[PDB]
Amino acid sequence: EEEDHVLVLRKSNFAEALAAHKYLLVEFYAPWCGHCKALAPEYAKAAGKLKAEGSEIRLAKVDATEESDLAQQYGVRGYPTIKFFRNGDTASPKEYTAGREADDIVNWLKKRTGPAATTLPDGAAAESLVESSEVAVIGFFKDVESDSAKQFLQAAEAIDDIPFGITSNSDVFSKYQLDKDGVVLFKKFDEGRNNFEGEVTKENLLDFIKHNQLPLVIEFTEQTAPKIFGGEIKTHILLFLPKSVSDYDGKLSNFKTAAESFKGKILFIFIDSDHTDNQRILEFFGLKKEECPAVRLITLEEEMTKYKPESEELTAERITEFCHRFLEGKIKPHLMSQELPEDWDKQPVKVLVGKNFEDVAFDEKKNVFVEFYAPWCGHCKQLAPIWDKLGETYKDHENIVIAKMDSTANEVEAVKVHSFPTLKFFPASADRTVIDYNGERTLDGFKKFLESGGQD
Amino acid sequence: LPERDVYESLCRGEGVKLTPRRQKRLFCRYHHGNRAPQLLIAPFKEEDEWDSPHIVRYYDVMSDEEIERIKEIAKPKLAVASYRVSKSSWLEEDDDPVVARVNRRMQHITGLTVKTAELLQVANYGVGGQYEPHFDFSRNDERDTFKHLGTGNRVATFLNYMSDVEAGGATVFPDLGAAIWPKKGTAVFWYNLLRSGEGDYRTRHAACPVLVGCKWVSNKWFHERGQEFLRPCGSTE
């Protein structure tokens, strides 16, 4: 069934439609969704345009309110969810995330199905390509149908962030030093150009590009952040370097020298710690401007884990040795912890930091109730007088301990807090029992809970 | 009129005091910006002002220098009889890089695009008058300032507080019994439309008149168009 050149798909005809069309875009929609109502005329307009051009690309729709099992099979949780199917492959459909206009749809489809590398007839077309992007890759092949040219085109179709070019013109080769077939990466930073060395395979090309597409040391700004964190490099190293520091250039050069050893593996970033715009990042690491310059390393693999060098000697050798020890699994994760106050236990409410949390909260002889708070949190400020009154009530209790920890400046391995205030109870035991308090934040509620042995 | 009574009692800080059952659902968090790259290493502080609908306050959204610069651009552009006593202006990104920087900051925080959003509205409020309860999403039966834009209805409101008000000036939600108090440099954010695109009628709100001081505020209204991929639909409602 076809409505305005869009194929109407159901669980009964879906497999037939995927087998019939090499290039099929499928919209999973719901008739009550505002976004789907707005998309429908643009989706039909894009389908009509592709049909008028004689394109093999076809557009289709699935009503997820009637075809629930079919939508579930493709993990559809929102509407519209748009997925592109190539060669009838149902295992890896590509999600469409680009603009809502008919032209964005048509352009997205043509950009993915089109030529992996743009044919460059001359040196002016090649310069225009290199100037159009911060990084551009050009394949120099006398025969575009050669097996090396095909492996280059397979590497070109796997990379979307870098524009690719392909040339057979001898002038373009001669431009700078190319005598025979080869691949060249161009960039607007560092050496400006990298020549491919080795056998021309898809794997060797992608590994070479991955290693040389990133600049050595990057300045952290709101403009560079999306490029750094949009990237597949899940290991980063940050140098907080105040512009007021003595020998700024020399210390930055030591960081650059170390970075040469980890190209493509660890991304090197520096940031001005004196600037007010960079304050949130300093605060995220529990760092003060007086503690700068400092170096931190982070892994972004789902659980963001931080690492810090044992030595704060910021030489090219020490930065290289720290990176190697990290890669060797020889450095333990850094969990933030404030200095333990001299009077931490003097008050009815005990003060905890990362350093003493474990031996206090997990004391087998004590029933410890801990408030994990943030100093700026309004709801924590309102809870504070109730918590102080709870501490004052149980101050002389044989086994009950009331405690608090600033979770903005202290991180602990046993408990991870992402809302404030979070209240957790640690009953008197050596099996590390933890009971989360989800009741009303009243002195009455806390008493019932403590007196019930954490049950109520 | 036990409507004016409710409005005025909320303006005076009286009315509904949250039950410990409602209060136990409100928290503070470091906002990741729905994994916006910038905010992964520099998250903003977010605090829940209401649990349903979700009304949040973001801290440190603007510095005093950004605020003053915006006020300087706005002041000249600020200034049937009009009983409500206030002035307003609309700012373009080309006026100063500060306007472009705040718009981009709001996009990072909300996860919504500013490409289809309205200009940064700057409003100054004078002591007195009365601001009536209304819905920011205008009715689709009306021929207003939304069909000509072709960007759809206002999906969300981002209210920045640009001044310390000595007394008064809260933003009150009569149907919720919620009053949101001015705090210079902070912003309050809520969605005007549900996941479905239909209007959230719980978000009926009004501004309390300023009692002592001058309330400076800047609003950014996001429209539904362009947010299809940023805020997808959720099954039934």
Residue numbers in the entry:
A (entry chain C): 21 to 476
B (entry chain A): 284 to 362, 376 to 533
What does the original paper state about this entry?
Collagen prolyl 4-hydroxylases (C-P4H) are α2β2 tetramers, which catalyze the prolyl 4-hydroxylation of procollagen, allowing for the formation of the stable triple-helical collagen structure in the endoplasmic reticulum. The C-P4H α-subunit provides the N-terminal dimerization domain, the middle peptide-substrate-binding (PSB) domain, and the C-terminal catalytic (CAT) domain, whereas the β-subunit is identical to the enzyme protein disulfide isomerase (PDI). C-P4Hs are Fe(II) and 2-oxoglutarate-dependent dioxygenases, which use molecular oxygen to hydroxylate proline residues that are present at the Y position of the -X-Y-Gly- repeats of the procollagen chain. Studies have shown that the β/PDI subunit is required for providing the soluble and catalytically competent conformation of the α-subunit, but it is not understood how it is assembled with the α-subunit, how it is involved in intersubunit disulfide bridges, and what its role is in the procollagen hydroxylation reaction mechanism of the mature C-P4H α2β2 tetramer.
Here, we report on the characterization of two truncated human C-P4H-II variants in which the α-subunit is lacking either the N-terminal dimerization domain (C-P4H-II-Δ140) or the dimerization domain and the PSB domain (C-P4H-II-Δ281). The asymmetric unit consists of two C-P4H-II-Δ281 complexes, which are formed by the CAT domain of the α subunit, complexed with the complete β/PDI subunit. The N-terminal region of the α-subunit of the C-P4H-II-Δ281 complex, residues 284–328, which was previously proposed to be part of the linker region between the PSB and CAT domains, is actually an integral part of the CAT domain. This unique N-terminal extension of the CAT domain, not seen in any other P4H family member, forms two short α-helices (α12 and α13) followed by an extra β-strand (β1, including Cys311) of the major sheet of the DSBH-fold and another short α-helix (α14, including Ile324), before continuing into the secondary structure elements known from the other P4H structures. The structure of the C-P4H-II-Δ281 complex shows that in the CAT domain there is an intrasubunit disulfide bridge between two conserved cysteines, Cys294 (of the N-terminal extension of the CAT domain, in the α12-helix) and Cys504, located in β-strand βVII of the DSBH-fold. The assembly of the CAT-PDI heterodimer complex is stabilized by interactions of the unique N-terminal and C-terminal extensions of the CAT domain with the a’, b’, and a domains of PDI, whereas there are no interactions between the CAT domain and the b domain. The CAT-PDI protein–protein interfaces near Cys311 and Cys529 (of the CAT domain) include disulfide bridges with Cys397 and Cys53 (of PDI), respectively, which are the proximal cysteines of the CGHC motifs of the a’ and a domains. The third important interface between the CAT domain and the β/PDI subunit concerns the hydrophobic interactions of the Ile324 side chain of the CAT domain with the hydrophobic pocket of the PDI b’ domain.
